[PDB]
């Protein structure tokens with residue numbers, strides 16, 4: 001009955017909290033990697049004399065600098081989602097006590113926070129997808145200038161960039177699970193009200 005539902009809603013919300021934390025942490029790790037990659041890039045780009053290599057490295061550098069801002073915006077929306085979660089927690093625990101009693105505004109509020117969190121999650125996924133895509137384009141660009149012999153520093157850059165991709169992917173994967181939890185929270189939630 002609702003008792004198992006209330007338990008399930010509660011468990012999902014807890015999972016969601018653990019995951020969100022886990023994601024914030026991975027995104028700070030990504031930011032450190034981006035900043036480290038940029039440092040290696042700008043040295044390589046400055047040291048380059050071959051014009052083809054130089055122009056390529058410059059395009060990748062420029063784009064990598066832009067990822068920093070995208071990541072900051074991602075971090076902020078992350079931290080916003082944690083704040084909405086706090087209010088879901090607080091409002092939720094009052095609904096626990098109140099049930100369906102009184103006017104609907106508290107139930108509405110809970111429901112709207114869940115809506116906003118869902119929207120932040122999508123924005124999050126879209127920003128992430130934009131970073132990943134351009135990061136894969138940079139792998140491609142590096143490959144165009146690693147023909148033949150040499151490029152030992154270019155290979156270090158390729159390697160750090162591939163490692164960044166791995167981390168980005170790990171993170172899109174956690175966010176997918178987060179959006180899935182939120183779906184489930186909405187489904188179990190609605191059922192709590194329907195059964196009421």
Ligand code: HEM
Pocket residue numbers: 005006007009010013016085088089090091092093095096110111112114115117182185186187188189190192193
């Ligand atoms: C928007 C659709 C949702 C509806 C209709 C809904 C409905 C409810 C209801 C009726 C309760 C009271 C029962 C209980 O306390 O277990 C509740 C509690 C709660 N909800 Fe939701 N909810 C929704 C989404 C969310 C989301 C997305 C989260 C978190 C991301 C969340 C977190 C909570 C929490 C933490 C509680 C208190 C759990 C507890 O400690 O008892 N809810 N929700």
Ligand SMILES: [Cl-]
Pocket residue numbers: 047048049050053
């Ligand atoms: Cl060169």
Ligand SMILES: [Cl-]
Pocket residue numbers: 059063134137138
């Ligand atoms: Cl590009």
Ligand SMILES: [Cl-]
Pocket residue numbers: 169
């Ligand atoms: Cl992918």
Ligand SMILES: [Zn+2]
Pocket residue numbers: 034063064067131135
């Ligand atoms: Zn990047």
Ligand SMILES: [Zn+2]
Pocket residue numbers: 059060063134135137138
């Ligand atoms: Zn690019």
